[PDB]
């Protein structure tokens, strides 16, 4: 299976987004447009590329096989600070100032606006099964939101209010699963915390000597990778209230704050984007850099992704068009028969039915 | 060659009729067809006379099913013409069933070849549809099957006869024969895809027309032989709507979820106490569970069509389920087991499509009412009766409970988990040590599945009884029933992960 | 009352023939009868004429299976007499089927009441058996159903007509109609149980073994046109009778000749396509050969079900049989002999089910290596007219066998096999996520995900499973369009969360 | 319902006594000889087998009859231990340094395993009955695969020789491949092993010889009976080599040789050489009950009482086969694999309605 790196920068003189193969570094796709903001690049349903614009009040959209953006834009009442999409491709989340806007991809309806943060929303992330989403903010607050409670509410309140962090939240990372998932948070208070979604309890807290700008864990959650403000990536082995410094647990080479961190599917490769205008590939075992990709500005988005069939097929077109996303608060548009894909009768099912017809004809005639 | 000898063997045997289906099955098993010209000529010769038409049709079925690409391309048009000729021979109905069964595969494979598809759609399918429409009333099942095959693989070439096809299908959606009614409902639901953007519009108007007709029929019902005909029409139209919801369509459509849910709620909002006992009242009371069941399959079809997009209507759906359970609650079987089993199946399907977002048994009057109904249907209770009485509602309730606990268990309050422990742990050991639903091995397997689900997804404030459940699985792995013992052996492998961590 | 008004509702509407089955279904749904004399009188009146016999039998179907015990004790003999009367009316065969279907439930419920059981045994069952034996040839299936019903619930009273019943069943054991042949074989296997029972069971089983040995010698002539077909029909009927005797409940303990049955099974599977002389009748012997092997495999399944893990000492032979049969029948195009390979994989799954971790499958030796090589080729994706889901039945069966074996015997299986499965399953699960393939079927995808979960749950002690890649695969599969695959992946992700977040140090 | 099955070395009136755990009232009693240590087995939940103390045969009982059956399992030497398969298919006996295996279906002496070079002291099966572990006075712990032994001279799957003194007890967990085995020895050590890998996971060192060992089903605690009368609790759920105040059960005045835990793990049964069986609360380590016996306790276990003990009219489904003394035809009941497979109400209703509809259409 092909793995790719989707990276954006704050300058974007020629391309606003570049996708290249992980193990070769050769560009696979390429998009032109404006400038994506930090934490403001989502990939919707494997067919579209949403990018919240840097300093603007709207979100641009792309088709995976076209370099020019679509005409439709997701306009917002204020500046867009972050943007995420549910892994099932059903909802879109954007942090507009202190509030979170939720859109239905089925209809384009702005379903809810969540206003519980008293400062700007810094980051947004869904759980693997798209049953919860977690929001961080400049108010040092991490909120756990149930999608079932938010969608069915007539104001909604978070499932958990995590206020242990004392400085604004910089990054979040949610593990696989829903209620049984674990969330890692980072903050300017030089601490990274690990939580439980179901109980709402703090499981771990690691203190560093510098502010942590990014955080990620592998799928098996063996390690926690923390990006420092001076260019150091720290590794925390997950096997309470620890502290760092350990010389062999640091990735060295970045000269500026590491704001993006991603791990490969097997966990053997670490992706790091930093403010020194460089995206780097690391070997998790040897802590040595494999590839150093230079960019034209500070990296705003950088992730490792399993390339969808859309990314490989040059003739791909999205199954449904992007709906008109409403700017203000039973008509679902969908394709029928998807639930029964692969349910066609097999050879022995078809053969035995025809043989039964033959036997019935023999008995009757 | 092997296949050549095995072909010449039955060529010489035929050139016997009671053995022919077995010979065709054996020839298909060896893959001899996939030499062949002799078989083609033999089938053509046998198809000429009524006395030998069954043998020719058997040979034709084998040839159509197992032909290579080149032979099929060579003989597809001739085979279609022979099938049509058989279809217009005034032969017994079984001959027509066999001919239609062959034609289904012939049309399925011909649609895969662009040249054959073009030639047939241009020059042969309207005549085939005319032959199917001209069949005798005794062969209406075969006619419906043939038209269904024609619209399945050549829907664009069926648009010229769309009105006659619609008239044929609409006359049999109220048929009293369940198989004919099902076939006619399946055929009618395929009409919006017939003909040359416009298909989306056709789907929408057809679905709204069905909704309006269903509302009128419900108004007629919720007011002798008239009521039975009304119920037959209602069931046919509801089945058609559900088939249109749950079947594949070639274009995106706008599903009016609010209108369908409104009709479902209206159907389920009338109970036994709403019906008077004078006049035709007892007849309406007798027919009411069937109407509620029709609404229940409509709800199932909507859930399948929309999936987790229905999460905004979860409050209404989770109020609906205990409402129906309340409306149909009473070695003797308890009444209304079909309705309760359908409700529990709908709950299981909703949890399947929603995951941990289902919100079932997670606080409220409806969550506690559903739990009360679920717990009573999984509880055990000279005379005439059955030892495994009430094992259908028990198994469905166990499946729904285990699915909900596995998916939404961590979000469920700990007192519910304690109640489930106190009910289930004495139950698994109570069957390992008269008339009971747990004399059925299916119910025992479902109870063990519920125990494993309680172990796997507990509340973060209530640890599950690991040791007692380990003893229960150990006892069940020694059971006589292979269904229960193998499941209990597999469950102990999962429990080894809960007992011997690797991290 | 409620049910009383709904009961009287249908009496006024029946005194509507096409609507009657639905009316009976509705009455059964409401439980009105379970909670009645007018209905009994109406059913008696309707049953007195051919023009209304169907209506009377429809009423009797509801009156028999839903009556309270008092009404059943009061009217059981009258209902039996009416049913026996219907069986002697020269009515159309469908009427006979309906009457026999009612009589089955009637006899089942009468066997539960000692007084009615004794009365019917002494005074009424021989007459019923005589009426069923004296039926027209076009009603021979209903006669077999009635004989089976009488035999199941009143076996002690069937011993006086045992010879006539055996003669009736034997002639239809070689029937070309699958349903009639199956029913006749079911009826024949119940003969030792009626009328000492253990002795009769053993003599009947040994007689069946001797007859099967004689029939295989004629079929395999020269290896071990129309007479061969009847020979194979008789062979299949007798083997089905023996398998039914093995796998059906018997009232007394019996001694199972495991070695003799296994010897017959091995003799049947010992002749392959290579030994048949293709001159004269040879091609017919070659065409019939897979069906005889399938009969032997069904006998093996029946033996495994009957004996269970007691068959473990014969495990070497049983486990060497499977790759031998797979080697015999091996060659959008469907591969041939998929029915035999699917049967072999089903036998493997059943063997692991009854033996658990003691099965010894996939654990060293030429037999284990050959079985693994066969299993891996049937689950591999392929490397015009046809089917996109071609070769998906053997893929699913092999996947189930592999998953069951790994879940049960995984820790004892060597780590080389675990790495071999990891190197193939992991590219496959993510390869189906991002023309013709067995994995276009959702059944095959679900079984592949089950195999991945089994590899996670029971790994080799010297080989850690790829947990992260499997987690990614389960995450991708839970977003699938198919509800089967997605729901299975959700539950597998719950299990993998249990694997990832330990509750014990 | 849980009961305690206890035997003593003297046995003047009853060779074995079964009493309810929480009431203490004698549920069942048996007349016979004297069962030896590690020599009492329950076969298929219907028969009570007791290897005789210092004798070469095994006595058998019906669970509802106080008098032993005339059939005795005779052995060529003194029987040292006796265990039965959890599935009731096999019977193992330790005869000097060899292990005799019998098929309960046929009574044939299938194997004689001679790998121990001194007397076998303890024998135990795994929960799934796929492996059995034997310990002996030769300080060896042997893991045997039932598949390999039945399909074979056979050799043990594992040979555990870490102990330096004769083995006193064994205990196996649930499962057979993924199971864990606890072994105790006179060298004052209790060890925990893995059946699959054959690796030593834990080893706890004490100041006295360990005569008994047991574990709860969840494997949270290890209970080790000392030679002086103390039972030590070792928390598995909270290194590879430990060394043993509030985790000691006090009250026995002589060596504790029998140890059992209840199903929930809250009650511990101990039999000792002071002719006394005690009940303990695992959480508080206080003696709930004390039962006086007429001699040193040889066997004492807690088990879930089968339906055989609860019904006074119970009879075994199959009679006991004649067990062969020297090295097809399986005797069994048919149709057990399909127990509970009867058609349900909805299945029968649908079949009947299908018949009705078929009859309606034709006629």
Curated annotation (Swiss-Prot), chain A:
One matching Pfam family: WD40_alt
InterPro entries xrefs: G-protein_beta_WD-40_rep, WD40/YVTN_repeat-like_dom_sf, WD40_repeat_CS, WD40_repeat_dom_sf, WD40_rpt, WDR18/Ipi3/RID3, Wdr18_C_dom
UniProt keyword annotation of Nucleus present: yes
A single cellular component GO annotation: rixosome complex
Keyword presence, Cytoplasm: yes
One BP annotation, GO: DNA-templated DNA replication
WD repeat coordinates: 33-72, 75-113, 116-154, 164-205, 207-245, 253-292
Keywords: Cytoplasm, Developmental protein, Nucleus, Repeat, WD repeat
Subcellular location field: Nucleus, Nucleolus; Nucleus, Nucleoplasm; Cytoplasm; Dynein axonemal particle
UniProt similarity note: Belongs to the WD repeat IPI3/WDR18 family.
Assembly and oligomerization: Component of the 5FMC complex, at least composed of PELP1, LAS1L, TEX10, WDR18 and SENP3; the complex interacts with methylated CHTOP and ZNF148. Interacts with NOL9. Component of the PELP1 complex, composed of at least PELP1, TEX10 and WDR18. The complex interacts with pre-60S ribosome particles.
Function of the protein: Functions as a component of the Five Friends of Methylated CHTOP (5FMC) complex; the 5FMC complex is recruited to ZNF148 by methylated CHTOP, leading to desumoylation of ZNF148 and subsequent transactivation of ZNF148 target genes. Component of the PELP1 complex involved in the nucleolar steps of 28S rRNA maturation and the subsequent nucleoplasmic transit of the pre-60S ribosomal subunit. May play a role during development.
Protein name, entry field: WD repeat-containing protein 18
Gene name, Swiss-Prot/TrEMBL: WDR18
From Swiss-Prot, chain C:
Protein purpose: Coactivator of estrogen receptor-mediated transcription and a corepressor of other nuclear hormone receptors and sequence-specific transcription factors. Plays a role in estrogen receptor (ER) genomic activity when present in the nuclear compartment by activating the ER target genes in a hormonal stimulation dependent manner. Can facilitate ER non-genomic signaling via SRC and PI3K interaction in the cytosol. Plays a role in E2-mediated cell cycle progression by interacting with RB1. May have important functional implications in ER/growth factor cross-talk.
Post-translational modifications reported in the UniProt record: Transiently sumoylated, preferentially conjugated to SUMO2 or SUMO3. Sumoylation causes nucleolar exclusion of PELP1 and promotes the recruitment of MDN1 to pre-60S particles. Desumoylation by SUMO isopeptidase SENP3 is needed to release both PELP1 and MDN1 from pre-ribosomes.
Motif (LXXLL motif 4): 103-107
Annotated motif LXXLL motif 8, positions: 284-288
More about this protein: Expression is increased in breast tumor samples.
Annotated motif LXXLL motif 9, positions: 372-376
Tissue occurrence: Widely expressed.
Residue span of motif LXXLL motif 10: 448-452
Known partners and oligomeric status: Interacts with HRS, RXRA, SUMO2, HDAC2, RB1 and STAT3. Interacts with PI3K, SRC and EGFR in cytoplasm. Interacts with ESR1, the interaction is enhanced by 17-beta-; the interaction increases ESR1 transcriptional activity. Interacts with CREBBP and EP300 in a ligand-dependent manner. Forms two complexes in the presence of 17-beta-estradiol; one with SRC (via the SH3 domain) and ESR1 and another with LCK and ESR1. Interacts with histone H1 and H3 with a greater affinity for H1.
Motif (LXXLL motif 1): 5-9
Location of this chain's protein in the cell: Nucleus, Nucleolus; Nucleus, Nucleoplasm; Nucleus; Cytoplasm
Motif annotated as LXXLL motif 5, chain positions: 125-129
Motif (LXXLL motif 2): 23-27
Motif LXXLL motif 6 per record, residues: 205-209
Segments of this protein annotated with the region Required for modulation of ESR1 transcriptional activity: 69-137
Note on domains (UniProt): The Glu-rich region mediates histones interaction. The Leu-Xaa-Xaa-Leu-Leu (LXXLL) motifs are required for the association with nuclear receptor ESR1.
Short motif LXXLL motif 11, span: 453-457
Chain positions of motif LXXLL motif 3: 59-63
Swiss-Prot record, chain D:
Complex and partners: Component of the 5FMC complex, at least composed of PELP1, LAS1L, TEX10, WDR18 and SENP3; the complex interacts with methylated CHTOP and ZNF148. Interacts with NOL9. Component of the PELP1 complex, composed of at least PELP1, TEX10 and WDR18. The complex interacts with pre-60S ribosome particles.
Superkingdom of source: Eukaryota
Localization terms from the record: Nucleus, Nucleolus; Nucleus, Nucleoplasm; Cytoplasm; Dynein axonemal particle
Function: Functions as a component of the Five Friends of Methylated CHTOP (5FMC) complex; the 5FMC complex is recruited to ZNF148 by methylated CHTOP, leading to desumoylation of ZNF148 and subsequent transactivation of ZNF148 target genes. Component of the PELP1 complex involved in the nucleolar steps of 28S rRNA maturation and the subsequent nucleoplasmic transit of the pre-60S ribosomal subunit. May play a role during development.
Entry keyword Nucleus: yes
Organism of provenance: Homo sapiens
Keyword Cytoplasm recorded: yes
Family listed: Belongs to the WD repeat IPI3/WDR18 family.
Protein name: WD repeat-containing protein 18
